[PDB]
């Protein structure tokens, strides 16, 4: 307060251009270091203690916000201003203070938000950046301002910002951050080479936060007019609309983001340590997160734009990514994105965000043929990209640590990021295999794109110089543990990953162009179907839905194989698979609890008559039917104290969509937002006191919708397994040569199948959705 009062008395009144006054009694270096240490201690205390933050800000005698903002208007060193802005940022973490800080920032004009026609010399942060920080080659004030804005945007976003002084909205701050900070950061001199990246990180964090919470509304596409001083002016659009508009057009902002990703991967390809590496990696991560948020919101933004009367054209981000890179003079942006997968062992976060973008763009049918072109144009790049995808699938650590709740939060975060990277790569392969050839999955699985795909000779990695491919990684994941009595390790430890691996193998066997090469390779090199079918049924208590779908995809693959081997008269192989499915194997009991005794490999063949030990000899095809439960528990009906059940069921139905797998599920995130929006629309003193109870009842509604979604997914997985089993039985009876199964044994098998299907469907708890598949099987069996 004493420094604020002393420095303000010396501000020159604008009317005396004539006399040399003696030098300003500046803050001494020791007083400066003292003030900085006090502000840093203050920041640290209020950063961790909310009660200290509120109690200091509300202190009527100290008025810290007013004094600090008043000191920012004085001619003080930029280091002290940067610490003052960090202290304001630390105060702005509480939403009550943040709303007051927004109003105080507009009143103090620290950034000039109001341009009066006639002053050609701006006062404020934009001039300090361009005249003071640029001469020092150090940018502490600009970073501290970006940190203040980043914290204020996270704690409170005021819609009426600047109302009465200017058109309401955030646009003047967005223009400063975009045009003055971000677009110019590369053209600036830096004394510390690392600070170049600290400035890029600090602005991109603000853009990411502004776009993360923004959802396109119909109101954003209508020009709102606001009266200011007797003139009608158009209101400013929300900052997320402006960010979407620049990212979905050929803008300098999109070009700067893409060139930052190119600079990032080019530095990482050196494999050397360099100053500010961590900050460059984060700045690139925020660029990935911005593009990924853009792709997620793009369809809704373009549909609302098309419904609007705005004369604005916007281009799909996926088409802009096919633009000519101005630096390389080639369309290499998608290649530069995919090269981050080659760094997956060294930086898992950037490989994950790369896999997520590539999975999102690969959904679009028009782009697949071009991406395959871009990836295959340079043979050296093509091989490196293949290695990137393979190395992310082959990562051993992603399978090993999901159940240890007691190890450091950062290791569990990294293993989960690597696991989710595998999931995005497999989803990219699955989604690309549903598209017409040539597609990206054919490249990554090792198909020859120079010839018709059906003429490809798949071989083991290293044979005749064949490279390792995602097909090899998928087969190795499913083969890990097949020699052990328990079966494939991935079925138990990573059941959803194993599901997607079996789905890729099924799609390769089901597609007419890939089936011939695939099934030949799986039979001759890998003996894959026999080795996997010996371990059916899979039974995982925690993950029944995934286990049921794994069995479904494997049974459908076996159904294709039995049909094709039967049609092609491959009698010995057909007979080997039929014996595995139909022969009387001894039950090995599953119970991991039974300490008991290495004694009895020595009693002898003899004794063809007496019926009082059911040595449980049960055919594999009946054991697979046994593992399909026909009953399901129906979730208990919602009991609600404040919400009407009839309205909630309509809201749930309005929140239902088809998942990527074609299943109808309720969008829990969209439902939570609709319910919270309705709770926020409730005005009155009684609603504020009941807010905790309304939020508790929102949580009971969300739990019920999760259980209902689990039921619907379980019913679908049961239906999928029973349909896959029915198709297998039908191919065994219709396509396999009649002399492979003796007429007597065939009759016994059909009678046992008819009795077991009837017992399971006649049960009172049996799901009515399964009846059409069962009646189809009973018809074909009879």
């Amino acid at each position: 307060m004493l420094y604020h009062e002393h420095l303000r008395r010396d501000l020159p009144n604008t009317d005396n251009i004539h006399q040399r006054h003696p030098p300003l009694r500046g803050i001494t270096q020791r007083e400066l270091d003292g003030l900085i240490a006090c502000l840093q201690l203050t920041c640290t205390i209020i950063d961790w203690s909310e009660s200290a933050r509120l109690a200091l800000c509300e202190h009527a005698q100290w008025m810290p916000v007013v004094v600090i903002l008043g000191l920012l208007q004085c001619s003080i060193p930029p280091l002290l201003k940067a610490e003052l802005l960090k202290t304001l940022a630390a105060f702005g973490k509480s939403p009550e203070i943040a709303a007051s800080l927004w109003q105080s920032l507009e009143y103090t004009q620290i950034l000039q938000t109001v341009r009066a026609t006639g002053l050609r010399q701006g006062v404020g942060i934009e001039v300090e950046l361009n005249e003071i920080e640029s001469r020092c080659e150090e940018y502490p004030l600009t970073r501290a301002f970006c940190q203040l804005i980043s914290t204020l945007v996270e704690s409170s976003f005021p819609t009426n910002l600047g109302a009465g002084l200017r058109a309401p909205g955030f646009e003047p701050y967005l223009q400063f951050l975009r045009d003055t900070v971000f677009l110019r950061y590369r053209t600036r001199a830096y004394r510390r080479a690392a600070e170049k990246w600290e400035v890029a990180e600090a602005v991109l964090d603000v853009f990411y936060k502004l776009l993360k919470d923004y959802e396109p509304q119909p109101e954003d596409f209508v020009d709102q007019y606001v009266e200011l001083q007797g003139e009608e002016r158009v209101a400013f659009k929300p900052p997320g609309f402006s960010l979407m508009h620049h990212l979905l057009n050929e803008s300098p902002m999109l070009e700067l983001c893409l060139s930052l990703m190119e600079e990032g991967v080019t530095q990482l390809d050196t494999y050397a340590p360099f100053p500010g590496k961590k900050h460059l990696e984060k700045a690139v991560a925020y660029c990935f997160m911005l593009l990924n948020l853009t792709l997620q919101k793009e369809n809704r933004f373009m549909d609302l734009l098309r419904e609007s009367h705005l004369s604005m054209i916007v281009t799909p981000l996926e088409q802009l990514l096919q633009g000519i890179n101005p630096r390389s003079k080639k369309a290499d942006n998608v290649v530069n994105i995919a090269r981050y997968l080659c760094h997956g062992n060294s930086n898992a976060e950037l490989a994950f965000e790369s896999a997520k973008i590539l999975c999102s763009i690969s959904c679009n049918s028009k782009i697949q043929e071009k991406i395959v072109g871009d990836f295959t144009q340079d043979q050296n790049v093509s091989q490196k990209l293949m290695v990137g995808f393979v190395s992310c699938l082959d990562s051993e650590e992603a399978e090993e640590l999901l159940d240890s709740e007691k190890e450091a939060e950062d290791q569990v975060k990294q293993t989960n990021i690597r696991y989710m990277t595998k999931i995005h790569i497999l989803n990219l392969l699955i989604t690309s295999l549903e598209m017409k050839a040539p597609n990206l999955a054919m490249f990554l699985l090792g198909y020859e794109l120079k010839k018709p795909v059906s003429t490809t000779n798949l071989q083991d990695s290293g044979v005749l110089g064949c490279p390792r491919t995602c097909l090899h990684s998928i087969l190795d994941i499913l083969r890990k543990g097949t020699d052990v009595r328990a079966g494939p390790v991935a079925v138990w430890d990573t059941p959803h990953l194993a599901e997607l691996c079996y789905q890729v193998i099924y799609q390769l066997c089901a597609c007419a162009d890939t089936s011939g090469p695939t099934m030949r390779y799986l039979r001759t090199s890998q003996d894959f179907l026999f080795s996997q079918l010996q371990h059916l049924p899979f039974s995982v208590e925690e993950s029944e839905i995934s286990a049921m779908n794994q069995m479904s995809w494997l049974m459908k693959t076996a159904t294709i194989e039995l049909r094709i081997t039967s049609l092609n008269r491959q009698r010995s192989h057909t007979q080997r698979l039929l014996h595995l499915l139909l022969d009387d194997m001894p039950t090995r009991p599953y119970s991991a609890d039974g300490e008991g005794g290495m004694e009895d490999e020595s009693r002898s063949l003899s004794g063809f008559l007496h019926f009082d030990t059911t040595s449980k000899v049960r055919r594999k095809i009946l054991r697979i039917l046994d593992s399909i439960q026909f009953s399901n528990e129906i979730p208990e009906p919602l009991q609600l104290d404040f919400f009407d059940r009839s309205q909630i069921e309509q809201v749930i139905a309005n929140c239902e969509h088809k998942n990527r797998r074609g299943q109808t599920v309720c969008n829990v995130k969209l439902l939570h937002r609709v319910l919270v929006a309705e709770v926020n629309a409730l005005q009155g003193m009684a609603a504020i006191g009941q807010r905790p109870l309304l939020m508790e009842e929102i949580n009971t509604i969300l739990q019920y919708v999760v259980e209902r979604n689990k039921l619907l997914q379980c019913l679908h997985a049961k239906r999928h397994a029973l349909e896959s089993w029915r198709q297998l039985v039908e191919i065994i009876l219709t396509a396999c040569p009649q002399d492979l199964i003796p007429t007597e044994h065939r009759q016994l098998i059909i009678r046992d199948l008819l009795q077991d299907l009837h017992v399971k469907i006649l049960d009172d708890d049996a799901a009515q959705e399964l009846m059409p598949i069962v009646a189809g099987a009973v018809f074909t069996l009879t």
Binding site: E50, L54, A55, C57, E58, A60, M63, V65, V66, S94, P95, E96, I97, A98, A99, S100, L101, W102, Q103, S104, Y107, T108, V114, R115, A116, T117, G118, L119, S155, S156, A163, G164, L165, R166, A167, E227, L228, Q229, G230, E231, R233, D641, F642, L682, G684, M685, A686, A687, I688, G689, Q690, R691, P692, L693, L694, M695, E697
Partner: protein, 205 residues
Amino acid sequence: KLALTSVFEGLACKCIRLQQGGEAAQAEAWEWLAANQLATVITTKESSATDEAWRLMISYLDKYEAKNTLYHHCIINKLLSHGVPLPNWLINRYKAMDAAELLRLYLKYDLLEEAAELVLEYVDALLGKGHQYFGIQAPLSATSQLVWFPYSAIDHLRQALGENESNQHNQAILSKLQRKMDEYFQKLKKATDDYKKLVQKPLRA
């Protein structure tokens, strides 16, 4: 016999912290709200802890009327010091009590738009539109009591709106304010001339 000022500042500070606070601050608020005699907690499932904290504040202002606007001033000055928008019920109560002190509070915190809307409404109230919202017993007439016009605070508002020549919005507000001031001065001149005519009819009774 202590001043209740520290109680009202602290309650205002808790209401501000509640309005800025996440779900954790709302959970902690029920504990201290229950420790105060809200004579009417109907726990309807729709009231936030923030709404009940504001109802408590209203009930204390109603129970403990100071002879001077001190408690309302203290709460408003505290809310404005934290940059929190003033509740319409508090504005409307304080408009009826002392609109000139409210204008000085908005000027002290650089709230030029709200200060200009308050002056426009206060001038409309003096002209006879909405005079009840400002506690003005009779609008500007030849026989009405002289209402104190805070001319110096309005001239400071005109200066503060005029110092920013670049803001077309502040000029639109300033021109709207000037046109309304001219309407007031014309009606004041007419009411003063009609008062002079009332004084100039000769006592023949």
